[PDB]
Design a protein around this nucleic acid. Sequence first.
RNA 1: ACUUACCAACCCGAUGCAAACUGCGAAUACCGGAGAAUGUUAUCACGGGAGACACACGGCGGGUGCUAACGUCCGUC
RNA 2: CCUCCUAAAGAGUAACGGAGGAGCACGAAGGUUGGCUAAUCCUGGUCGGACAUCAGGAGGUUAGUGCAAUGGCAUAAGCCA
RNA 3: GCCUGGCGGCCGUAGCGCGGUGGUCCCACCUGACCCCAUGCCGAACUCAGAAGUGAAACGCCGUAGCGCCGAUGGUAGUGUGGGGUCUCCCCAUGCGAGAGUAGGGAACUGCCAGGCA
Lengths: 177, 116, 50, 75, 94, 136
Amino acid sequence: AKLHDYYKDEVVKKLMTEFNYNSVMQVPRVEKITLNMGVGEAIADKKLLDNAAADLAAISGQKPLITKARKSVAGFKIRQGYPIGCKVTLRGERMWEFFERLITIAVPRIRDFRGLSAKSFDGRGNYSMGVREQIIFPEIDYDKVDRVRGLDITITTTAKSDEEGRALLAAFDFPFR
Amino acid sequence: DKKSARIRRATRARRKLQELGATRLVVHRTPRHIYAQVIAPNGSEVLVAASTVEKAIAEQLKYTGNKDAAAAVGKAVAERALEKGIKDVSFDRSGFQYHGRVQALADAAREAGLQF
Amino acid sequence: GIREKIKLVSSAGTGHFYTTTKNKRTKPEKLELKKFDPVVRQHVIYKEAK
Amino acid sequence: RNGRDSEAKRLGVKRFGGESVLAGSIIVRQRGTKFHAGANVGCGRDHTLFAKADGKVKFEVKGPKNRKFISIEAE
Amino acid sequence: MFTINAEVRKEQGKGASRRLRAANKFPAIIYGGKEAPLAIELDHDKVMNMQAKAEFYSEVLTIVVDGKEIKVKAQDVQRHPYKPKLQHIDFVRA
Amino acid sequence: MLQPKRTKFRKMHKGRNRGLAQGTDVSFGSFGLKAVGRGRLTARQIEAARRAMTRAVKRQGKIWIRVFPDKPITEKPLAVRMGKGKGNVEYWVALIQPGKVLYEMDGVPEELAREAFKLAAAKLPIKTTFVTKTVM
RNA sequence: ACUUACCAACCCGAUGCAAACUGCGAAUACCGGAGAAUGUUAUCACGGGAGACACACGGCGGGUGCUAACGUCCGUC
RNA sequence: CCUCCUAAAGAGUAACGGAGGAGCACGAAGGUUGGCUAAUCCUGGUCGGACAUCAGGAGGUUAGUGCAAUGGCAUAAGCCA
RNA sequence: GCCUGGCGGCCGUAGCGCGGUGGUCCCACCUGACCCCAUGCCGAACUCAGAAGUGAAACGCCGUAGCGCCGAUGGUAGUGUGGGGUCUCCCCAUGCGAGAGUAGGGAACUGCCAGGCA
Ligand SMILES: [Mg+2]
Ligand SMILES: [Mg+2]
Ligand SMILES: [Mg+2]
Ligand SMILES: [Mg+2]
Ligand SMILES: [Mg+2]
Ligand SMILES: [Mg+2]
Ligand SMILES: [Mg+2]
Ligand SMILES: [Mg+2]
Ligand SMILES: [Mg+2]
Ligand SMILES: [Mg+2]
Ligand SMILES: [Mg+2]
């Protein structure tokens, strides 16, 4: 909830002032935060998914959704419809509280930090990256991990251009390299 | 995508009325306001209609868009049909779930002497 | 074939029975279903799945 | 290694547009709904179309996919 | 600059045109603009030679039909399937 | 030898060779060799005729082949009783109707194209003629 | 990490091929309706007495075979 | 036995003609009510590999249908409860 | 009488495409979500209360011939009937006559009801 208020009073105004937008309903706004864990190797060790799911719960109390293989393909010795990942869709209060759990109490604690890359807006203002080690979230302690497990994060926006994605995050500081 | 999802969800129920020759009670709901009409099996002439955009029963409502408002709309269509002579119909919820306001309009229509 | 014929017996004394099939391997338990007994004129419960 | 075929199922149209039929009379035997049942016409489990009323058969094309529909108007 | 002498057709369809070609003539047609199409019949040998110089397909030709004059351009042409002749030509009142 | 790399079916009803041709103008080069008579071209004939023009022009000039076998011809060998199934595929033909442009050429002077396409006509089972690009 | 007298899908414009491909599409033919003419009722039902189920050729539409057969198998006159 | 085909645009049509299949499956892979939408290019992204998984648009039933072919399929017959 | 909500007719000359657009009323996102209901997770939907903003998204209308679509005429191919030659094919009389393409039309037409602007 802290980051939804801070967005309105200062960022709305600021983002209006880059390209001099005419309407407040045109400024891109951050809509949702989606977490995913690609396990991939759960087909051999069935419990690796079970241990992945509980990881997400402490980051985002929201119980995770499990994503299926869809296409059978022998090219990975897999079945179809067998679980091979998990996801969580964040909106509203938790999304803003989760966003907080990311920059302020994780990023100072990133491994070999010098900033993140800024070229990855797929071309339409949505940002995607990854983290190698999940012990960076403080609901997760070090004495409670059975695995060097990790997870990619992808964000989704209402910006229409790549330029309009960089200005929106810049206004949220966001380290950038 | 928001509007188009509901229209497809309703089509099947509407073809049965076409096969059956049924007279349907059509509801349209919006975040600001709720609407009720009565359309003949041919689909293109309204025998009765009643809604919250009408000044009579609509200013006397706390908000032209709540379950009570839907209930006020519901009450009016049943009787008005009686004022003309139309009485047995079927409810076509037009793809809204049958639930919030939509059920208040239907419940009110049944209470006031309408067979459906 | 590889699917056996069974008889369903009415749980109301009548001597009406239905006939159907069953995968006895994959489905080892006794099948149980309401059916119309034309003698008691009601939907009564039916048992058996040999 | 060949030498096989199937018996013909005698499908096709049995009552054409412009023909007086009773109720229950079969109008078309088909595999899919090449033709669809229109107003006052019914559909059986193998997509056999039959008359639900006494009258004359009428082929029309209606709706956005240009499907053929068969109906019966009473005479 | 080329000037073609033409007569108006009294018949139409496959029989007359095969009969025309049987009579060493061949049909052609004039359409375009607001006025109605004009069915014509042409002498075969004269147009075959004309169109054997590229100028025919890019210049404004003059059709003389019943002693008047219609200004057209060649627009499409049907050639004999495998002999050096012509089955039909389109002209446009451009 | 030209031949379809794959086909849906090995064998084909005899069919007919009615009607007129679609390939009737020179559509790639400047000059063309056009089919007059009606008939079937075997793959071996098309190859023998294709060679004749390439001998004649050295490794100069480009050639397009507008017809393509596409049609399988079967035969029953010697000493076989009638019936008992359709023959084995032996070679491949294309069906030709009058007017089909068979070969085109461009990159030599007209006089040489007529000579070069002509040293081919003696290899074909149907009468042919020399045709040229035409404005429109 | 590069080049590459190689091969080269998709993609695009040009170009033909298809009995088991069709976003087009006839000519006939069949169904059904009404109507004048003509027609030894030619029609339909039921019942009595049979023969018949080795076919040939020609025309056309085709499979087969070699668009071979006084070949061969169907459709139709 | 089934599907397409020759079969000449209603039905049928032949050969030791041309290609394939069936002798099962399902207690839900059945009824109904509510509700749901594929194949594949490009770009971006943890271990991402040409192609496990999240995201963006391009795309529009080529997907899918318990299996042979054909005709059907979006009101879906497809997918879930 | 112009505009927008709703229900159909006709079923691509009704549609994309790009440019512009409108919010008083309607539609629309929308704000809050403790409860009717709700996520194989998430107030995105389903949705209950709501009217502070907002034409930005989409929605509705308009201009627009790059694409689709509609596409004559004249001709060609076929073809039923009769006859004919060179009878693997074509031709003549006759009636029916494509498809693709072409000059061209082309940015829908409507009935109803409701509301808002004269
Ligand atoms: Mg003729
Ligand atoms: Mg026939
Ligand atoms: Mg008699
Ligand atoms: Mg016998
Ligand atoms: Mg005898
Ligand atoms: Mg004989
Ligand atoms: Mg015979
Ligand atoms: Mg047939
Ligand atoms: Mg990639
Ligand atoms: Mg706008
Ligand atoms: Mg035309």
